[PDB]
Each structure stands twice: as C-alpha cells, then as structure tokens.
Amino acid sequence: GCCSNPVCHLEHSNLC
Numbered sequence: 894g895c896c897s898n899p900v901c902h903l904e905h906s907n908l909c
Contacts, residue, residue, distance in 0.1 A: 895901035896909030 895905050898905075902909045
C-alpha cells in the first residue's frame with residue numbers, strides 16, 4: 894500500500 898510504500902509514504906506520510 895501507498896502508506897507502507899516508501900515513495901508513496903513519503904508523499905503520503907499523512908495516512909501512514
């Protein structure tokens with residue numbers, strides 16, 4: 894998932 898992703902977590906460090 895985007896949240897457990899690196900880049901997608903970077904971008905979405907909100908959710909995660």
